[PDB]
Amino acid sequence: MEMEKEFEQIDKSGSWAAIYQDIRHEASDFPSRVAKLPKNKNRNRYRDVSPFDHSRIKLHQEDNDYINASLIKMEEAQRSYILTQGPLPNTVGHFWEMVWEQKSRGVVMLNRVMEKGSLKCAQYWPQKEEKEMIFEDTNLKLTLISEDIKSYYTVRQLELENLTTQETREILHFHYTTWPDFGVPESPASFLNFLFKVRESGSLSPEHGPVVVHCSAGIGRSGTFCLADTCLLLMDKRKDPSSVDIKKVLLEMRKFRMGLIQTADQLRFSYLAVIEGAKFIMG
Numbered sequence: 001m002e003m004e005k006e007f008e009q010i011d012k013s014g015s016w017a018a019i020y021q022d023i024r025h026e027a028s029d030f031p032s033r034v035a036k037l038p039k040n041k042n043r044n045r046y047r048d049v050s051p052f053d054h055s056r057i058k059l060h061q062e063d064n065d066y067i068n069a070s071l072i073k074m075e076e077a078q079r080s081y082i083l084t085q086g087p088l089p090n091t092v093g094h095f096w097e098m099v100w101e102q103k104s105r106g107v108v109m110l111n112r113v114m115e116k117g118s119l120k121c122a123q124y125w126p127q128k129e130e131k132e133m134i135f136e137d138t139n140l141k142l143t144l145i146s147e148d149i150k151s152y153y154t155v156r157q158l159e160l161e162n163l164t165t166q167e168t169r170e171i172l173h174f175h176y177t178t179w180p181d182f183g184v185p186e187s188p189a190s191f192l193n194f195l196f197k198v199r200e201s202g203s204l205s206p207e208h209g210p211v212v213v214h215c216s217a218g219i220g221r222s223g224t225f226c227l228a229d230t231c232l233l234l235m236d237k238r239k240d241p242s243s244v245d246i247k248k249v250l251l252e253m254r255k256f257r258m259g260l261i262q263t264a265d266q267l268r269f270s271y272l273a274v275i276e277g278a279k280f281i282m283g
């Protein structure tokens with residue numbers, strides 16, 4: 001079926017939970033043996049969220065190459081994304097090592113450091129120009145260059161230096177700051193505006209390594225971001241945009257990381273975002 005009318009048909013019939021459970025039942029199951037080794041327990045935020053072995057990102061280290069991060073490679077859309085958990089106190093250096101080694105231009109953050117009164121990820125970037133951060137375990141330096149605070153999101157320019165080679169690179173930090181502590185946003189308008197700002201920066205384009213995107217577990221909000229982006233790109237590329245099947249795209253993405261889209265409300269919000277986004281692209 002088309003998307004907008006399949007949408008109204010699920011609303012009128014109130015069957016979002018049943019649709020979402022079908023997706024959970026059909027989703028791929030692949031091994032995640034490296035994630036579950038005992039030496040990696042303190043590298044995982046949640047015991048039930050792990051990268052598959054076949055798609056995990058490897059750190060360029062001979063001691064321990066493990067990080068909780070997955071490469072989502074969308075062949076028809078010609079887009080790749082790295083989805084990862086919010087960094088832990090003991091994995092902030094690994095996180096920036098990955099950004100460096102994978103040649104990423106941008107980092108997309110979809111959570112606040114504290115939500116619901118608890119810490120959802122480490123404070124992993126500097127908040128003042130004159131107070132830079134040094135990660136001694138991975139030999140990297142990170143400096144805040146500039147910050148632009150808007151009503152729904154903040155964009156930061158950062159300098160990452162590899163202290164071993166003295167090479168430097170400019171990294172863009174796109175921070176969506178207004179996702180509610182509970183539920184999903186009422187309108188997709190600010191989320192779509194944010195996605196378009198990331199696109200306009202070049203961070204999603206083939207001349208760079210994959211964008212790094214995270215929330216707290218790296219599957220819920222993060223899944224919503226890449227699902228919406230890929231579906232809108234496919235609608236632009238195909239002769240028949242109504243052929244794009246968001247459930248099929250989500251199941252394809254779940255071949256590369258488990259659990260993408262965590263609730264039926266996030267599924268409905270993803271449909272809403274793609275539907276509204278497809279009108280603005282054209283009007």
Ligand SMILES: Nc1cc(Cl)ccc1Nc1ccncc1
Pocket residue numbers: 235236237238239240241282
């Ligand atoms: N809207 C639309 C519908 C059909 Cl059937 C064919 C072409 C368009 N136009 C497009 C196509 C691809 N990308 C943008 C616009």
